Design a protein around this ligand. Sequence first.
Ligand SMILES: [Mg+2]
Lengths: 27, 35
Amino acid sequence: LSEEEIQRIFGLSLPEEXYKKXVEXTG
Amino acid sequence: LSEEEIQRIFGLSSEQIKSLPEEXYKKXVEXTGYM
Ligand SMILES: [Mg+2]
């Protein structure tokens, strides 16, 4: 999985901004 | 994007999905190519 694919999949520090869009996931 | 889809995409154990944002972050790090 590329960083560009993570942007597309999550609709976007990538790890930090991963964790926050994770939290927004847990609602 | 559901928790179930994220579990499958990143191969997460039943244990890992207890900590989805943290185990997000770690599978984020492995994204960037770091360890
Ligand atoms: Mg937590």
